[PDB]
Design a binder for this molecule. Structure first.
Ligand code: HEM
Ligand code: HEM
Ligand code: NA
Ligand code: NA
Lengths: 717, 717
């Protein structure tokens, strides 16, 4: 190999291939963002003319362009596929992928095989982005175009929320180890898909449309359909709704040989202006289009919503055949339906075809049962598709406070993890002061208070913006029983005391000020940090924003919340079984999910350690003689050359730190020592371990604690 | 191969390995910086007691630590090597390297083989950094330790300037293509060394202490010393003075086999807490230290400044021999000087030794003349050494206005590319106003005005902070005949014209006010942009900051300014020969040298295009119908799907863009089309090409224009 210029990707990773990469802690850095610091997308899109935008998209959808002519003179089905693929990278294990960031316009997603031809589709919408400018993100426009497509063609949607914020640099995501497009090294056991992946091969959205590994067996395919769609928050009824409603529209593209399609967009020459997959087959477009290389037209009305898709699936029998590109598909037996299905550009008319994955809907017995009932009762399909599509293109939007505009339905949805509206006056400064003192008199230790508040708030992940302290869910299932939150039952004692303080405050409060359990969880930790800072000779006030509300168990989907359980939390020195990488990688990933910078992550670790936030309160990384004191001791001691460090002889992922006499003075994990070992992190430790650094450390720790407590609080932003 | 998680370094570079890497335009991002945005290092270091700091550093030098015991009970010599290596990565071709960012503490430099044992060196200074905190950067501390070491041991230095701001991530720099440490793939012909490198092997500071490629030919070694030191701005006298001055102190370390030396610090295990090359030979330290593999102690007084180096070098005859670790070195013939050279830990006392590269000082004709003199005139060595040492450790400081603290001698030095003090009062507003007019009332066009300003300001590179518009050196040699600046034409007229307006204002001016050529060259470009903005219907004012002053040709080291000649400037669509990478990479690299973000580069390219900034007024990229109007036409037209691009038949490196009627309507280079082809650049273009973007584009253009105008203006901030 050969080292390259930094402008061509050279860097320290080439000399140290498994190097912890801190650039995950500064994604989308402000210097790369072209808008001012005052720029508030939510404010711009809040003033958009939605009706005007609908007409302009309608106009685009029916004005064929010569560089990519429009099947049946309507771009709608292309745009449905576009939005579906944009939202369809979402996966539940880490909440990443999805439509929320407009990531389909950037690498690698803009060059995935499954996104072939969506480069043209995005390009067709530049007229619309052009006219609305900063009032309309690409992220919002991409999925709104699909939503408008549906309604254009006869299907009434549930609603729509604007507010997805455009970004300027692709989120770098782990999409699998396979270094070959469409490779599959992601199954073990009996067909167990590698976590966190939610697609069956590298560069597919969900499943192979020719069946598992290109074997067009509808029964087997359905197993992949069910599991990948599960991993994208869709159950049996939603998955069936989505496939049937999607393939009510449009057609597939495989007019000629695949080997005549050029490089994907990121690999194409400059002259193609970001377009890829340039084809030399015929005109290379339109009548000659090659996208997947399958050539199916599901229904006789590809630009109208109706029940044709299921009427056709069940009203013919199907035999296996080959498209012009040589791909597996199904056509109707015995020349039935010959010439019943229209051509995209006026041609002679063709006979019914379905994909292998489509037959799964009638060959798999669960799917058969659902789709047959919709054959008989189509109105039920419309309802399920509407709910499913709405969830699909909004799944990663975060709390409902983020949904903007005149198309947002008012109804509450379980999958949104709803919290109640505020129903009383919120606590002011005086009640906040009083309540902090009451928490400090309750008997709860600094350690219990800080760790409870951290447990509740750090459940937020910035990918899909699920989790967090709002909702008071730490006292509900499943959070109340997560191993990291509740090693020893200590959490229930905390919850009880905070509930008693809530009750007594609320029954005594002055005229209709009430406080939620959710707020007192966070407030309690803020109060403990004030006390520990006073124990260390600093008088500081920890900020606090009231307005969290308490969800009930019935408004908390227990199984949906399963994916938010931490398997690793370096901030609590917790490391469960099953993580993909060593502990320090996991910490970085946890910091990334909390939206933390490297300095923010660094001060929280050092503060949390000396505050006693450690899982099971064990002494790893607790490099201080003081108890519940907010000092910078963690950084001073980590830089003490009087300590010698060696892996503990027990080979247990811990380290022994000995002073000059040889006596073991400190112990620590990989997560503790990586701050003393990694040259970028140690640089940060040297800032916070200086003689002059303690006031800055308290100050920056309180700011990062405040940030983490406030992560899900879009109701005040 | 296998793709990795992003936290383990994986990303889009792996699918497309030669892609344009925009990270080079957001180095040292602000979210990674632990200090405030308000942090002001000049204000912090101003408060430092330099005497107390000197004394504290002297404590460190004479207090030996057990984990790296001090040769001769004095760490001074080790710190001088540390300082010399900190500064010894600098190179004139791009000005990268140097001590000015403290980059020795980060990867890759912290782990170069030539930087072995300096991990221990930097570690020993932590007690100092701990005490001074944010008032003293590591970057300052590392070279100031070397300087203090010199003074400590009886050498009076010329001075020292503080002011190097610490950074938080490695500056990523192309150090060569060899993927092997010490590997050699950088030579062609008879010892022609690959540009832009200044070292003979990968991970060496300058040359191989055993002679080229381990061939201990002192005559041939001097060839590489002369060439490597010249590429770090040192001539023959400075180079001989540096080596003699350095090797007056300390020793090398090669007490046993190097296969007993463990991994370099970026590879070493967590428990080593940032240190590396852990060694199982003997105690692995002190008596048993192994650093380079050589074992030479040059003088009989390793902790004292005197003339022993050259007296030994010349007073003995030298024969080849092998260090305990199999390294080539020289020793005294005839057993002369037995037992005369003292042991660093009380051992018996040894014979004289020299490196092969030391012998070059006596073998090479040119060095031998210089050093023969110093054998009888140590006062001249001492003088040249102080001058050269001072220049080595300040080469990348930028303008003199930046040198901070009480140890800066006022004497002007030519290598600092000096500019005169402000002789008179400075043009005020009313004055500034009137002179825009006289310049608009000249026959100077927006094209020549804007282009001449840019030509001057854009000579600044942020690597070593040389260059820029202060000094008015555009009218001097060499800038005035740089192929890019005046392809044989308009320059001299703009120069001649602007000088005339200098008199007309000066020969008649209000009181003590005068104005420099340098300040007009900039203000010219400025008022032009006010004109081109008017022609586009926006009334705006471009900021301008007076204060520049004219240097003489006599104050302009013509050769020193040669390395500042653009072989490439995408902002003027100029692409000379010799460039190591295709045009679009040269574009990003030039924007990095100008400290520009990606949004800044984008607005600047679009804006200058439509002002005629182009080399030879070429039509490439000038996507506008307007003459000297400042619109966003470049962006709008770039995104025009009505245009079709293909490479010019000519194989020019140009492209034609045809309208529907097959007519060429635009032409462009790689640099122009990359803004429409690269997925991240095109995102920026779509911000500025939108309907509502004209005011914002002008604003950001001016703000970015201001920034490039002010790059060298450290005298005002
Ligand atoms: C089993 C999962 C699915 C598979 C395997 C699948 C596969 C495909 C394939 C291969 C194409 C043809 C691509 C081409 O060459 O042009 C296609 C087209 C399409 N799919 Fe899917 N699909 C799935 C689910 C969905 C879903 C959930 C939707 C949306 C609700 C959807 C909507 C569409 C649409 C609209 C097209 C038509 C594009 C056009 O008219 O140009 N599909 N699908
Ligand atoms: C041709 C140029 C040079 C070569 C080939 C060279 C080579 C070396 C080598 C191989 C070592 C051994 C390090 C070890 O094993 O501990 C060393 C040490 C040293 N170098 Fe040089 N060097 C050069 C220039 C300089 C310069 C320009 C300076 C200062 C201005 C300098 C100052 C020192 C000092 C003080 C030591 C002793 C450090 C100690 O006592 O640990 N060297 N040099
Ligand atoms: Na239909
Ligand atoms: Na000496």
């Amino acid at each position: 190999g050969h080292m390259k210029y930094p402008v061509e990707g050279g860097g320290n990773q080439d000399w140290w291939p498994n190097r912890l990469n801190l650039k995950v802690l500064h994604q989308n850095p402000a210097v790369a963002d072209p808008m001012g610091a005052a720029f508030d997308y939510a404010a711009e899109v809040a003033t958009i003319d939605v009706d005007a935008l609908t007409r302009d998209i309608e106009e685009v959808m029916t004005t064929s362009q010569p560089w990519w002519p429009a099947d049946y003179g309507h771009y709608g089905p292309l745009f449905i596929r576009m939005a579906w693929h944009a939202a369809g990278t979402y996966r539940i294990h880490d909440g990443r992928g999805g439509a929320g960031g407009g990531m389909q316009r950037f690498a690698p997603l803009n060059s995935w095989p499954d996104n072939a031809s969506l480069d043209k589709a995005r390009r067709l919408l530049w007229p619309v982005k052009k006219k609305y400018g900063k009032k309309l993100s690409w992220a919002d426009l991409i999925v709104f175009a699909g939503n408008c497509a549906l309604e254009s063609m006869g299907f009434k949607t549930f609603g729509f929320g604007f507010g997805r914020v455009d970004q300027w640099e692709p989120d770098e995501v782990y999409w699998g180890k396979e270094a070959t497009w469409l490779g599959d090294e992601r199954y073990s056991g009996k067909r167990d898909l590698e976590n966190p992946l939610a697609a069956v091969q590298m560069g597919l959205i969900y499943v192979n449309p020719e069946g598992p590994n290109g074997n067009p067996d509808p029964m087997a395919a359905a197993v992949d359909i069910r599991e990948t769609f599960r991993r994208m928050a869709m159950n049996d009824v939603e998955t069936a709704a989505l496939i049937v409603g999607g393939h009510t529209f449009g057609k597939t593209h495989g007019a000629g040989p695949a080997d005549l399609v050029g490089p994907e967009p990121e690999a194409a020459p400059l002259e193609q202006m970001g377009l890829g997959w340039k084809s030399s087959y015929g005109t290379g477009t339109g009548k000659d289009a090659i996208t997947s290389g399958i050539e199916v037209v599901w229904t006789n009305t590809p630009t109208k919503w109706d029940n044709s898709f299921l009427e056709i699936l069940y009203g013919y029998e199907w035999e296996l055949t080959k498209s012009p590109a040589g791909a597996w598909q199904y056509t109707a037996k015995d020349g039935a339906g010959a010439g019943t299905i229209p051509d995209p550009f006026g041609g002679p008319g063709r006979s019914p075809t379905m994909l292998a994955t489509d037959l799964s809907l009638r060959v798999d017995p669960i799917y058969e049962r659902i789709t047959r009932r919709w054959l008989e009762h189509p109105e039920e399909l419309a309802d399920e598709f509407a709910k499913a599509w709405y969830k699909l293109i909004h799944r990663d939007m975060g709390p409902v406070a983020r949904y903007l505009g005149p198309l947002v339905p008012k109804q509450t949805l379980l999958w949104q993890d709803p919290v109640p509206a505020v129903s009383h006056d919120l606590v002011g400064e005086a009640e906040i002061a009083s309540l902090k003192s009451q928490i400090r008199a309750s008997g709860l230790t600094v350690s219990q208070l800080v760790s409870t508040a951290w447990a509740a708030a750090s459940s937020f992940r910035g990918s899909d913006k699920r989790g967090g302290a709002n909702g008071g869910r730490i006292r509900l299932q499943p959070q109340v029983g997560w191993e990291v939150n509740d090693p020893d039952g200590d959490l229930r004692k905390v919850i009880r005391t905070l509930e008693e303080i809530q009750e007594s405050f609320n029954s005594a409060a002055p005229g209709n000020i009430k406080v939620s359990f959710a707020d007192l969880v966070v407030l309690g930790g803020c109060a403990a940090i004030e006390k520990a800072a006073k124990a260390a000779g600093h008088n500081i006030t920890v900020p606090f924003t009231p307005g969290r509300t308490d969800a009930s168990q019935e408004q908390t989907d227990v199984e949906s919340f399963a994916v938010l359980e931490p398997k690793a939390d370096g901030f609590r020195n917790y490391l469960g079984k099953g993580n993909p990488l060593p502990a320090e990688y996991m910490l970085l990933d946890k910091a990334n999910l909390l939206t933390l910078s490297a300095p923010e992550m660094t001060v929280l670790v050092g503060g949390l350690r000396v505050l006693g936030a450690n899982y099971k309160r064990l002494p790893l990384g607790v490099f201080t003689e003081a108890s519940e004191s907010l000092t910078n001791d963690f950084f001073v001691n980590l830089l003490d050359m009087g300590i010698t460090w060696e892996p503990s002889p027990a080979d247990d992922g811990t380290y022994q730190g000995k002073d000059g006499s040889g006596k073991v003075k400190w112990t620590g994990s990989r997560v503790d020592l990586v701050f003393g070992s990694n040259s970028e992190l140690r640089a940060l430790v040297e800032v916070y371990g200086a003689d002059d650094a303690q006031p800055k450390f308290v100050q920056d720790f309180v700011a990062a604690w405040d940030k983490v407590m406030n992560l899900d609080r879009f109701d005040v932003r």
